[PDB]
Amino acid sequence: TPIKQIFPDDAFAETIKANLKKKSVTDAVTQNELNSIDQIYAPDSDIKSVQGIQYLPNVRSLKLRSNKLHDISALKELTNLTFLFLNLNQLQSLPNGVFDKLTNLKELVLVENQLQSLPDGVFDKLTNLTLLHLMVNQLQSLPKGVFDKLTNLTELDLSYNQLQSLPEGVFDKLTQLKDLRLYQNQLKSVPDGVFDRLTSLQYIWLHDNPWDCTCPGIRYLSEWINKHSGVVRSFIPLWAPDSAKCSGSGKPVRSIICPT
Amino acid sequence: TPIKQIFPDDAFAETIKANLKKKSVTDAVTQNELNSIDQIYAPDSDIKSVQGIQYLPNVRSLKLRSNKLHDISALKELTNLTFLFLNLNQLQSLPNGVFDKLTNLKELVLVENQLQSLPDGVFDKLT
Amino acid sequence: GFNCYFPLQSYGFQPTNGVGYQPYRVVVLSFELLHAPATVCGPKKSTN
DSSP states (O other): OSSSOOOOOOHHHHHHHHHOOSTTTTOOOOHHHHOHHHHOOSSSSSOOOOOSSSSSSOOOOOOOOSSSOOOOOOGGSSOSOBBBBOSSOOOOOOOSSSSTTOOOOOOOOSSOOOOOOOTTTTTTOOOOOOOOOOOOOOOOOSSSSEEEEEOOOOOOOOTSSSOOOOTOEEESSOSOOOOOOOSSSSOOOHHHHGGGGGGGGSOOOOOOSSSOTTTTHHHHHHHHHHHTTTTOOSSSSSTTTTTTTSSSSOOOOOOOOOOO | OOOOOOOSSSSSHHHHHHHHHOOOOSSSSSTTTGGGGGGGOTTTOOOOOOGGGGGGOOOOOOOOOEEEEEOOOGGOOOOHHHHHHOOOOTOOOOOSSSSSSSOOOOOOOSOOOOSSOOOOSSTTOOO | TTTOSSSSOOOOOOOOOGGGSSSSOOOOOOOOOSOOOOSSOOOOOOOO
């Protein structure tokens, strides 16, 4: 879809003059040059012009430092990408209507993203989406049924967020997960018996905090301690048996047997 | 002495030095003896840069199997041609003023002439 | 406790830990193809 008047700057012209050392900026990239070679070698680049990047499929690294740029809609017409890599802290939204037409991308990466909302009932058909970097994710609100069918994820981090609710019917098929970190939680209301069905997991993080320890809140924690006492070691160098106790009163866990 | 950053064309120079089958490499080079060819016969010759061609007047007809070359610069000051073969489908205009000296043209082929209107006095001097 | 953790990180090697985390001795035998050949590349065998 060729359009005109898309390039307000000439930084890419400077890059071309530095690399190809061609005679003039007005010289267009010839058909022979593109059809002869397929790979371009220039590591650790700092290209400033974000335009013209759609027509070159050799995208590997884009350092997005641009003061005069105020448009993020230039990534709407991508329908042939296979690998993605970006770096931005203030990015909040991307144009929609892309996940339905493309079904070939495999790998993605994200750090300190601020994706405020995802469409509901979209990932169900996209069963091929395996990896998703959930680190320092800022998903303040999640739609119901996000990781129910998707059991192929290897890293699940919800630190520094406000998940007050759990997805519907998530615990039914949770027999293949490797790790799940419930620490740093700021919930306000939860149902009864939802945390008790998490028995196939391998590592829990809910101890060492001045939180509430009212029965039967610690009953699941006590059972998990008894059933996995020798497996859960602590990264911080310290004695293991006294690491995970009930907070509040400070009495030993072994003496407390919950009535009723 | 070899000089870098001079020739933009690799394939064209390679075919120039290869098709002639010279005696050896230890011979000298010049411009008058090299430019004895006025009609280039190179299949799929896509030479675009013709700027500053005023130092090479002996060429008359240029063949181009380059559908991509839509530049008007190929006809800004190239008025010594006698044959035309351009596969430029989106040709909606013809440059003016090139008829000031064009008297050595013999045969032309103008297919897909989408000109629904014609200018005045275009053929007036073509007696 | 609250807002106090460790800024450093450890390895956490355990016998029961995942078998795909033990340090495998994969030696990258970088055969640096420098311009220095040697005549003795094989014993030429000794037969009997």
